[PDB]
Amino acid sequence: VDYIAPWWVVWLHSVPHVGLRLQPVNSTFSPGDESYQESLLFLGLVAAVCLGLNLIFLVAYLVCACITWTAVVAGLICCAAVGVGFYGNSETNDGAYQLMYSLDDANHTFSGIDALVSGTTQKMKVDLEQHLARLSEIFAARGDYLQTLKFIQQMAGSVVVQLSGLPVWREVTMELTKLSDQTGYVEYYRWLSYLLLFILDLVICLIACLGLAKRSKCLLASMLCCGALSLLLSWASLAADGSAAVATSDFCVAPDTFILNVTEGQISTEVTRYYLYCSQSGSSPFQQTLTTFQRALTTMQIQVAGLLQFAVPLFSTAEEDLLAIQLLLNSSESSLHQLTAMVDCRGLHKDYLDALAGICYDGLQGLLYLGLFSFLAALAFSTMICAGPRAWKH
Amino acid sequence: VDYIAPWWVVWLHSVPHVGLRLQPVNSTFSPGDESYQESLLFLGLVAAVCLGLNLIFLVAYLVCACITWTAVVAGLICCAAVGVGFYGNSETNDGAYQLMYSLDDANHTFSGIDALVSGTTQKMKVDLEQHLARLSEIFAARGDYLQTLKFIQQMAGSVVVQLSGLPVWREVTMELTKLSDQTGYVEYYRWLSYLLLFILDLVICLIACLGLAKRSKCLLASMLCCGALSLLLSWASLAADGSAAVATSDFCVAPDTFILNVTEGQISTEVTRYYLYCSQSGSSPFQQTLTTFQRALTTMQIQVAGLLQFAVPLFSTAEEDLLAIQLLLNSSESSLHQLTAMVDCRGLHKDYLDALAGICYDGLQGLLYLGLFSFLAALAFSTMICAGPRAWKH
Ligand SMILES: *[C@@H]1O[C@H](CO)[C@@H](O[C@@H]2O[C@H](CO)[C@@H](O)[C@H](O)[C@H]2NC(C)=O)[C@H](O)[C@H]1NC(C)=O
Ligand SMILES: *[C@@H]1O[C@H](CO)[C@@H](O[C@@H]2O[C@H](CO)[C@@H](O)[C@H](O)[C@H]2NC(C)=O)[C@H](O)[C@H]1NC(C)=O
Ligand SMILES: *[C@@H]1O[C@H](CO)[C@@H](O[C@@H]2O[C@H](CO)[C@@H](O)[C@H](O)[C@H]2NC(C)=O)[C@H](O)[C@H]1NC(C)=O
Ligand SMILES: *[C@@H]1O[C@H](CO)[C@@H](O[C@@H]2O[C@H](CO)[C@@H](O)[C@H](O)[C@H]2NC(C)=O)[C@H](O)[C@H]1NC(C)=O
Ligand SMILES: *[C@@H]1O[C@H](CO)[C@@H](O)[C@H](O)[C@H]1NC(C)=O
Ligand SMILES: *[C@@H]1O[C@H](CO)[C@@H](O)[C@H](O)[C@H]1NC(C)=O
Ligand SMILES: *[C@@H]1O[C@H](CO)[C@@H](O)[C@H](O)[C@H]1NC(C)=O
Ligand SMILES: *[C@@H]1O[C@H](CO)[C@@H](O)[C@H](O)[C@H]1NC(C)=O
């Protein structure tokens, strides 16, 4: 699998950005640049002014003053709009959940790598030092096997030095978990808000049908005021959806560039590109460190086996500690296999692709469908309102 | 993440399976059992008889012979039903797509493992034999360096022997790809069929509104016949959804058991359990063979480097051969890191959990919502039909 820009993303990237004072700005995704927020704020103003133009248009129609066919058409358009809105809200929720799961999996992988490195270095320092110190006086009589103890100690120091070269993912873990919590809050509130909007739209459609059903004038004022409120709400929803869609498409155009120049200080660019691209040829930055770790572990097991074969027949007083060393080395080699499984680019690359498909493919499609909902609902309510003057003639 | 049985799965596991002759049959998921298949067939007959009872009920009502309120209620129930049906169809499609993606990624991982093993063994046999045979005559003047060549040859033999011990996933690739193609065909056809059913139901609702609108009797016969056809179709859909939901729940209760006795001959049980459970404490079955491979590779590079340090300054007859050996061994260690990354239980365990969540969590929920669609549409059309005798009074 690989990431290619879909047609909707590249087309929405072409939307011009002019900002508040209508000047060309750098189109590239860059939150925190005061020009960028103004450019996104301009798109909201376009819909806000479009609401003002629409509000005057419908009011003037009520001032300048087959009707059942227009009412039925308005109801049909409202039902189609709310159906499309339900579909779009579900799709946006799916995209946000995909992003949440991808971030959770990346957080778990980084936590696993960090825990493996920390546990391995802590064990190889503390427990190995303790056991060697305990067995040193036993081997103090014999100078050989005691040179070998120093050899093991120095190569354990080499292992710790090599392991310390691996990047620390403590900050990345915190960033990922806090951003996941933030997106959880935002997604829950947004989904609840759109569900409430859909329910209110359906209730207003039912009241609109009841108004002609019961021929009550007092209900007409309530439905009209609620329709105006829902109209302004739907125009605000259209503005928000347009801004969010253009921002998401702009980010989706250059996700690699964005991640490269956000995670530039905390994470080295070498491993950043390694995980972002996951080249199949090789050149993994961890290959040399893992090779050194595995070579050192293998030779340590060789010397410990030599101790077990020869020293135990002579110095059998306390050799269960050598068995403990063997347990330690076997567990450390299992941890080595786990570590080289985690640090591969395959899993994190799959998570990153899943996140992109969540926001670029499903999230953007859902946002576009929600914008279509907003526009269709606005048109339907405007048509219902302008048909009102001859609707209340009874 | 871990798999726990949801409430709907365990509740649907308690549906009584009695077969054709109403004899208690085992509830364990076994599509190859003739009795079990009859139990699913019995569930379809329950709805089929329920269709017969419903058909007589509505026919008798037309024989024994506010109406606009009943018609409006029927239309509202129809609209709600088709909305729920759209939601359920989308959810089932999402679940099937999740299953497709999990199977595809598992296929890719198995293909990667197989390709890595095959390439490594083919290279370590053919290229080692060729290069050593080419450089043997050069080293013919010294029995030393030839003892080393023989040692390298025997260790390459050990490497290929250890690598041959890894399981062959050729059959598993066939099974996964053919099942993915089959589920693609089935899901495409099923989604198209339900989309067509929803569209026809909406068209019939529109025609129902038009018939009362235009007061045309000739349209009433067409809407009644189409309603009867859609009624029998919806009852068949309910039968299919109930049977499929029961089968999926039966599988989802014991997925581990099902996979254990479906994949029993082609794949050994220990690795199947390792990939199904992915225990962090339990030693991986590939740990010993990967350790042997890495030890042999490191020692081989040790002898090759020793040769480069001593044979090259003295002989210098051919160095590109040893340089090619070093390229080969570096590439083989990169392949080793890739192999130990792929064979970890983490990736395939995540794939299996994703597939389970696709069919157990999303697929079954979508199927239940489609069954709700079928029942609601049947009730709505029955109510519309029984209101017809006083509807056509004009
Ligand atoms: C992201 O991973 C970190 C681990 O680095 C998780 O932090 C742990 O969270 C659990 C549950 O809250 C605590 O019991 C641990 O003490 C935490 N460990 C550390 C080192 O802080 C974190 O919960 C994960 N976040 C998400 C959203 O999955
Ligand atoms: C650590 O693992 C090694 C490798 O398995 C153990 O070495 C023994 O190897 C022989 C032949 O491969 C077999 O008897 C067993 O695989 C191992 N012995 C036992 C008793 O399991 C080594 O023993 C392990 N460490 C300890 C303390 O047992
Ligand atoms: C499952 O993996 C196998 C590889 O083991 C894929 O088979 C290859 O497909 C490509 C694409 O046409 C062919 O060029 C190769 O010749 C195939 N190899 C073999 C050995 O048949 C298969 O396409 C994969 N299926 C899915 C659905 O991903
Ligand atoms: C295969 O990889 C090894 C390990 O990197 C190469 O050995 C050299 O190691 C030293 C110290 O780490 C460095 O100069 C380079 O990493 C390696 N040398 C070169 C010239 O790259 C070994 O050279 C590699 N094989 C070949 C044929 O270059
Ligand atoms: C934004 O600025 C960067 C660097 O100055 C430049 O490479 C890029 O072309 C600019 N893009 C636009 C749309 O101005
Ligand atoms: C990241 O943003 C900075 C800030 O303007 C910019 O200078 C840099 O070029 C960007 N990174 C890339 C790869 O363009
Ligand atoms: C099915 O058979 C197995 C083995 O005979 C048994 O353990 C299980 O309880 C049976 N299931 C039912 C529902 O009787
Ligand atoms: C698989 O099916 C056989 C035959 O019915 C049964 O004996 C066995 O118990 C099943 N597998 C498991 C793990 O129970």
| C-alpha radius of gyration, chain B, whole number | 33
Token couple for B5: 């049985």
In a domain, B1, yes or no: no
How far, in Å, CA of A274 to CA of A282, rounded? 9
Amino acid at A268: S
For A287, which of B79, B287, B337 is closest by C-beta distance?
A: B337
Nearest to A373 by CA among A242, A244, A249: A242
Residue B165 domain-assigned (yes or no): yes
Q: Which residue of chain B has the CA closest to A82?
A: B83
Do residues B284 and B47 lie in contact, with contact meaning Cβ atoms separated by under 8 Å?
Answer: no
Contact by Cβ (8 Å): A285, B334:
no
Contact A303, A152 (CB under 8 A): yes
Nearest to A149 by CA among A335, A332, A315: A315
Q: Which two tokens stand for residue A179?
A: 């951003």
Q: Do the Cβ atoms of B31 and B37 come closer than 8 Å?
A: yes
DSSP assignments along A196-248, one per residue = HHHHHHHHHHHHHHHHHHHT-HHHHHHHHHHHHHHHHHHHHHHHHHHHHHHHH
Q: Is residue B2 domain-resident? A: no
| Number of domains comprising chain B | 1
- Would the CB atoms of A87 and B83 count as touching at under 8 Å? no
B246-259 burial, b for 16+ CB within 10 Å, e for fewer? bbbbbbbbbbeebb
Q: What is the dihedral of CA B45, B47, B51, B54, to 10 degrees?
A: 130
Atom number, ligand 1, closest to the C-alpha of residue A115:
5
The answer to whether the CB of A146 falls within 8 A of the CB of A216 is no
Centre of ligand 4 from the C-alpha of residue A267, in Å:
26
Q: B157 exposed, middle or buried (CB, 10 Å; 0-12, 13-18, 19+)?
A: middle
How close B39 gets to chain A, by Cα (Å)? 35
Asked if A140 contacts A146 with a C-beta cutoff of 8 angstroms, the reply is yes
Among the partner-chain residues B83, B337, B350, the one whose CB lies closest to the CB of A86 is B83
Let me know if A90 is exposed, middle or buried by CB neighbors in 10 A (0-12, 13-18, 19+): buried
Q: Is A27 helix (H, G, I), strand (E, B) or coil?
A: coil
The rounded distance, in Å, linking the Cα atoms of B330 and B300 is 11
User: Three-state secondary structure along A49-78?
Assistant: HHHHHHHHHHHHHHHHCCHHHHHHHHHHHH
Burial of residue B337, with CB atoms counted within 10 A of its CB: 0-12 exposed, 13-18 middle, 19 or more buried = buried
If you take atom 24 of ligand 1, which residue's CA is the nearest one? A177
Residue A256 buriedness (CB in 10 A; 0-12 / 13-18 / 19+): middle
Structure-determination approach: cryo-EM
- Domain of residue B177 covers 7-391
For B190, phi and psi rounded to 5 degrees? -65, -45
Q: Which of B309, B303, B294 is nearest to A292 (CA)?
A: B294
A165, A286 in Cβ contact below 8 A? Answer: no
Residue A9 within any structural domain of the chain = no
Residues of chain A neighbouring B298 (CB-CB closer than 8 A): 291, 294-295, 298
Partner residue opposite B333 with nearest CB, options A291, A342, A350? A291
Helix or strand or coil: residue A128?
Answer: helix
Three-state helix/strand/coil letters over chain B = CCCCCCHHHHHHCCCCCCCCCCCCCCCCCCCCCHHHHHHHHHHHHHHHHHHHHHHHHHHHHHHHCCHHHHHHHHHHHHHHHHHHHHHHHHHHHHHHHHHHHHHHHHHHHHHHHHHHHHHHHHHHHHHHHHHHHHHHCHHHHCCCCHHHHHHHHHHHHHHHHHHHCCCCCHHHHHHHHHHHHHHHHHHHHHHHHHHHHHHHHHHHHHHHHHHHHHCCHHHHHHHHHHHHHHHHHHHHHHHHHHHHHHHHHHHHHCHHHHHHHHCCCCCCHHHHHHHHHCCCCCCCCCHHHHHHHHHHHHHHHHHHHHHHHHHHHHCCCCCHHHHHHHHHHHHHHHHHHHHHHHCCHHHHHHHHHHHHHHHHHHHHHHHHHHHHHHHHHHHHHHHHHHHHHHHCCC
Q: A33: helix, coil or strand?
A: coil
The distance of A54 to chain B (nearest Cα, Å) reads 30
Alpha carbon distance A367, A102 (integer Å): 20
Residue B273, chain A, CB below 8 Å: the answer is no
Resolution for this PDB entry, in angstroms: 3.9
The finding on whether B334 has its CB within 6 A of some atom of ligand 4 is no
Whether residue A7 is contained in a domain is answered as: no
User: Does A383 lie at the interface with B, CB-CB under 8 angstroms?
Assistant: no
DSSP string, A244-262: HHHHHHHHHHSHHHHHHHH
- At CA A64, angle to CA A61 and CA A70, rounded to 5? 45
Q: Which residue in the block uniquely carries the two structure tokens 């929720």?
A: A93
**Burial of A31 (C-beta count, 10 Å sphere; 0-12/13-18/19+):** exposed
List, in order, residues 6 or more apart from B383 with CB less than 8 Å away. Answer: B70, B73, B74, B77
Asked whether residue B194 is domain-assigned, the answer is yes
How far apart are alpha carbons B89 and B194 in whole angstroms? 7
A300, A303, A312, A326: which to mutate for ligand 2, most atoms within 8 A of CB?
Answer: A326
Task: Give the HSE-up count for residue B139: Cα atoms under 13 Å, Cβ half-sphere.
Answer: 22
DSSP 8-state symbol, A168 = P
Query: Which positions 63-82 of A are in contact with B (Cβ < 8 Å)?
Result: 72, 79
CA distance B77 to B373: 10
Residues 307-366 of A with CB under 8 A from B: 333-334, 337-338, 340-342, 344, 346-347, 350
Which of B190, B118, B202 is closest to B160 using CA atoms? Answer: B118
Please tell me the distance between residue A244's alpha carbon and the centre of ligand 6 in angstroms: 22
Quote the tokens at residue B200.
Answer: 């026809």
Separation of alpha carbons B332 and B353, rounded Å: 32
H or E segment to which residue A309 belongs: none
8 Å CB contact between B366 and B92: yes
Query: Which helix H or strand E contains A327, and what residues bound it?
Result: helix A320-342
**Residue B381 falls within a domain, yes or no?**
yes
Cα B261 vs. chain centroid, distance in angstroms? 17
Give the SS3 label for residue A320.
helix
What secondary structure letter does DSSP report for A139? G
Chain A hits for B84, CB-CB cut-off 8 Å, are none
**B374 near B47, Cβ under 8 Å?**
no
Ligand 7, atom 2, lies closest to the CA of B26
Residues constituting chain A: 394
What number of CA atoms fall less than 13 Å from residue B244's CA on the CB side?
A: 19
Q: In angstroms, rounded to a whole number, what is the distance separating the alpha carbons of residues B303 and B306?
A: 5
How far, in whole angstroms, is CA B197 from its chain's centroid?
A: 26
Is B201 contained in some domain?
yes
Distance, in Å, from the CA atom of A221 to the CA atom of B20, rounded to the nearest integer, reads: 62
Chain B residues inside the 8 Å CB shell of A199:
none
Q: Say which residue the tokens 């068949």 belong to.
A: B236
Which residues in chain B are contacts of A298 at CB distance < 8 A?
Answer: 291, 294-295, 298
Residue B363: CA atoms inside 13 Å, Cβ hemisphere, count?
Answer: 24
| Binary contact (B341, A341; C-beta < 8 A) | yes
